[PDB]
């Protein structure tokens, strides 16, 4: 009936469990919060910020159109916003 | 006695740790304005 690990219901009603996880859970939440609130998420993944989809007088999509120059095209498009 | 750290412990935390992180990141997103 059991493989020897400790029952979950025994763990999550235990005092020690919640001593640790009342720290670790909010800490992880806050880490993920800050990942976004600092703007780091945008830079890591390359996701446009609300002001960075288009150039001011631009309604053309910066669509990648070459396979082997694709990396440079994206870079060209980003510099058209600096 | 019961062991603390197991394969089970790893599988659980492999999922739970990033879940809470993502949940915090997605919470922060609800206050982003354009």
């Amino acid at each position: 009936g059991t493989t020897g690990e400790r029952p979950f219901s025994d763990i999550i009603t235990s005092v020690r469990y919640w001593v640790i996880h009342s720290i670790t859970i909010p800490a992880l939440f806050i880490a993920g919060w800050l990942f976004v609130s600092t703007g780091l998420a945008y830079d890591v993944f390359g996701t446009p910020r609300p002001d960075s989809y288009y150039a001011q007088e631009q309604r053309s999509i910066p669509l990648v159109t070459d396979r082997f120059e694709a990396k440079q095209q994206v870079e060209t498009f980003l510099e058209q916003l600096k | 006695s019961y062991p603390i750290f197991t394969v089970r412990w790893v599988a659980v935390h492999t999922l739970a740790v990033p879940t809470i992180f993502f949940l915090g990141a997605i919470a922060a997103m609800q206050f982003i304005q354009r």
């Binding site: 640790i20 720290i23 909010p26 800490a27 600092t38 703007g39 780091l40 | 603390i4 750290f5």
Partner: peptide
């Protein structure tokens, strides 16, 4: 850059906190 430690600090501290609270039984 600096934002990366801001993000990583609650993680390391939470990890440290659990290390302290569990080290005695992990030994066993």
């Amino acid at each position: 850059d600096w934002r990366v430690l801001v993000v990583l600090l609650p993680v390391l501290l939470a990890a440290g906190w659990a290390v302290r609270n569990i080290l005695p039984y992990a030994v066993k």
